[PDB]
Amino acid sequence: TIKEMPQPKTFGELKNLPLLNTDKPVQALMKIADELGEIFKFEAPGRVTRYLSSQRLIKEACDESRFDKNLSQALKFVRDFAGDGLATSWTHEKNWKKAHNILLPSFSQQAMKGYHAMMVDIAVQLVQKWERLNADEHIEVPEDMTRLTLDTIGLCGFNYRFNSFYRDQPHPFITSMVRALDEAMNKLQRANPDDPAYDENKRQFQEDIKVMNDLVDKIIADRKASGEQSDDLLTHMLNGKDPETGEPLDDENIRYQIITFLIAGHETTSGLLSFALYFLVKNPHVLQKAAEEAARVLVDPVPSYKQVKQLKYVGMVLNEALRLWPTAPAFSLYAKEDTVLGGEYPLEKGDELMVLIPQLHRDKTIWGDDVEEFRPERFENPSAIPQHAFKPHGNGQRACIGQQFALHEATLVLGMMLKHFDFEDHTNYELDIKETLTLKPEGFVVKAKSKKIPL
Ligand code: HEM
Ligand SMILES: CCCCCCCN1CCC[C@H]1C(=O)N[C@@H](Cc1ccccc1)C(=O)O
Ligand SMILES: C=Cc1ccccc1
């Protein structure tokens, strides 16, 4: 039953590339999926991939015996500053499994318990900032969520204070990062990146890369000379030994891991929190239910690790926000061997796939007719959800290593926001999703009304 797969409109020798000439390429690709269905071919000069949108096909793509992680063009461009750190290495590169073995214990339960106090440090700064707003001032949500998540990975992971809440403008790092990511997303559609029209982009790309590397130097300098005894992510990077190869990470790879974790360790969690608050103010009944949980569980001025673990409904709220708007919206795979997808689409060894996660999460055959509704109760029973229906953290051994960190931070912070404030969508905000490879609301503002509960 070999089928012929659809393909969106082409532009001569540029093939489908100009379809990416937009500030919202993932959303453009979702619209193409709406029109073409669960699978479509997408070509650019010298490259073919296939976008998958249905759980029917993606459950086969998640078979690690048949498919391995591929570096998308986006990840290849990010590799220009993230090197062979965990997220931009091939599975078969020595440094992938070696760093994985070394850094996995930094996300154990016992590690999470160790990060918790510093997580609270930053969360309290967020709550205090909002308690200190004047009447009828408002909250810039993604901006403040990015302050929080950047500061949290800096402090918990590296004992470094970005002090983002002492800045009215984004930290230098954030500004460069967003620009490197902008450049990487915009470079996706460039048919001739060597055209001298892009010489300034190339120069600016290097400038932003040094800014990001300078902080990495300072983070490493401060730890090596410190007199304090740390046990955090940096500690493991500098001292951990891989059981398999027996070797620690070398200095060049450590630097790549720091860049990787500073970016991956915050940018998507700030998007998650922004989307979760958006859906909560648009769904007051859900907000109330999660606020009731927050009030019942967070009975102390400072949340404890054990209490965050009991914010189970807040946890479902976050999962449902990742369902509708997974903030890292795609991942890529290649066929390890010739194989047939869905009994219908033969693939040759090396053939590539793109998993379009926001579209997967809208598969009506899985979620039902109410698929656009925000119903955290969808997640009450993981056993009732078919395999590989829900993939906001990627797949298999290349799934997100930071998943527990992200969800613990987001549950703590959202729990505290719902404990301490009522929220008002005072502008009737119209969701507008900015793309920097990752996804985040833009211009989302709310007003908080303090419940006047002491910290
Ligand atoms: C809600 C927040 C987050 C989301 C949605 C998310 C999502 C993802 C996804 C989809 C991947 C797979 C990428 C691929 O297959 O190409 C991934 C990989 C990764 N994530 Fe996350 N992530 C989040 C938070 C974090 C945090 C906080 C950290 C660091 C503490 C982190 C570190 C990583 C790393 C290192 C990888 C590469 C893993 C490997 O291949 O060994 N992520 N993440
Ligand atoms: C933090 C998450 C980063 C990974 C998500 C990247 C997700 N892309 C970000 C923009 C759109 C989306 C994507 O579909 N990209 C493809 C684009 C592409 C396909 C075929 C030929 C050329 C280029 C790619 O990069 O290969
Ligand atoms: C570079 C960071 C990153 C984080 C999540 C998915 C892919 C890449």
Domains with residue ranges and CATH for the chain: 12-379+394-450 (1.10.630.10)
Q: What is the token pair recorded at 227?
A: 């007199």
Closest CA to 141 of 431, 452, 436: 431
For ligand 2, the distance from its centroid to the CA atom of residue 47, given in whole angstroms, is 12
* Residue whose structure tokens are 């976008």: 51
Considering every ligand atom, which ligand is closest to the CA of 100? 1
Among candidates 259, 294, 318, 315, which has minimal Cα distance to 84? 259
What is the rounded distance in angstroms from the CA atom of residue 203 to the CA atom of residue 283?
A: 46
Phi, psi at 438, each rounded to 5°: -70, 170
Q: What are phi and psi of 343, to 5 degrees?
A: 70, 10
Whole-angstrom Cα distance, residue 325 to residue 321?
6
Going by their DSSP bridges, the two strands 139-140 and 330-335 should be labelled as unpaired
Q: 53: which residues sit within 8 A by CB, 6+ positions away?
A: 33, 37, 38, 39, 356, 359, 360, 363
In this structure, the number of other CB atoms found within 10 A of the CB of residue 144 comes to 19
Provide the 10 A C-beta neighbour count for residue 436. Answer: 17
Solving technique for this entry?
Answer: X-ray
Nearest-10 crossing angle of helices 312-324, 403-420: 110
* Burial group, residue 196, by CB count within 10 angstroms (0-12, 13-18, 19+): exposed
Test site for ligand 3: of 77, 91, 150, 268, most ligand atoms within 8 A of the Cβ = 268
**Assigned token pair, 308:** 């965050």
**C-alpha 348 chain-centroid distance:** 30
Q: How far is the CA of 136 from the centre of ligand 3 (A)?
A: 37
SS3 letters across the chain: CCCCCCCCCCCHHHCCHHHHCCCCHHHHHHHHHHHHCCEEEEEECCEEEEEECCHHHHHHHCCCCCEEEECCHHHHHHHHHHCCCHHHCCCCCHHHHHHHHHHHHHHCHHHHHHHHHHHHHHHHHHHHHHHCCCCCCCEEHHHHHHHHHHHHHHHHHHCCCCCHHHCCCCCHHHHHHHHHHHHHHHHCCCCCCCCHHHHHHHHHHHHHHHHHHHHHHHHHHHHHHCCCCCCCHHHHHHHCCCCCCCCCCCHHHHHHHHHHHHHHCCHHHHHHHHHHHHHHHHCHHHHHHHHHHHHHHCCCCCCCHHHHHCCHHHHHHHHHHHHHCCCCCEEEEEECCCEEECCCEEECCCCEEEEEHHHHCCCHHHHCCCCCCCCHHHHCCHHHCCCCCCCCCCCHHHCCCCHHHHHHHHHHHHHHHHHHEEEECCCCCCCCEEEECEEEECCCEEEEEECCCCC
Strands 39-44 vs 67-70: parallel, antiparallel or unpaired: unpaired
For ligand 3, whether the C-beta of 153 sits within 6 Å is no
Say what the alpha-carbon torsion angle 195, 200, 203, 209 is, to the nearest 10 degrees.
-110
- CA 13 to centroid of ligand 3, rounded, Å: 31
**Residue 418 is encoded by which pair of tokens?**
């719902």
Q: Which ligand ends up closest to the CA of 212?
A: 3
Q: Which two tokens stand for residue 54?
A: 């249905």
82 lines ligand 3 (CB under 6 A): yes
Residue whose tokens read 């082409």: 10
Complete edge-to-edge strand list for the sheet that includes strand 330-335: 39-44, 47-52, 352-356, 330-335, 67-70
Read off the tokens for 356: 């379009």
Can you read off the two tokens belonging to residue 43? 């070509």
For residue 205, give the nearest of 304, 102, 77 by alpha carbon. 77
**Beta-carbon neighbour count of residue 166 at 10 Å?**
11
User: What is the distance in A from the centroid of ligand 1 to the CA of 306?
Assistant: 24
Q: How far is Cα 299 from Cα 279, in angstroms, rounded to an integer?
A: 25
Phi, psi of 63 (to 5 degrees): -75, 105
Name residue 132's amino acid. R
Using alpha carbons, select from 186, 207, 208 the residue that is nearest to residue 197: 186
Q: CA-to-CA distance for 296 and 425, rounded, in angstroms?
A: 25
Ligand 3 in contact with 353 (CB < 6 A)?
no
Backbone angles phi, psi at 346, to 5 degrees: -70, 140
Q: Which residues lie below 8 Å from residue 354, measured CB to CB, with a gap of 6+?
A: 42, 49, 50, 51, 52, 72, 330, 331, 332
Rounded Cα–Cα distance for residues 272 and 238 (Å): 30
CA distances from 27 to 5, 55, 358, 439 (A): 21, 19, 9, 10
Q: Which residues contact 339 (CB under 8 A, 6 or more apart)?
A: 66, 346, 347
Residue nearest to atom 6 of ligand 1 (CA): 393
Ligand sitting nearest the alpha carbon of 352: 2
Residues in contact with ligand 1 (CB, 6 Å cut-off): 69, 86-87, 100, 260-261, 264-265, 268-269, 272, 326-328, 331, 392-394, 398, 400-402, 405-406
Residue count of the chain: 455
Residue 217 neighbours by CB under 8 Å, 6+ apart: none
170 alpha carbon – ligand 1 mean position (Å): 23
Q: What are phi and psi of 57, to 5 degrees?
A: -85, -35
**Tokens 């060049």 appear where?**
252
Residue with tokens 């740390």: 230
400 is in an annotated binding site: yes
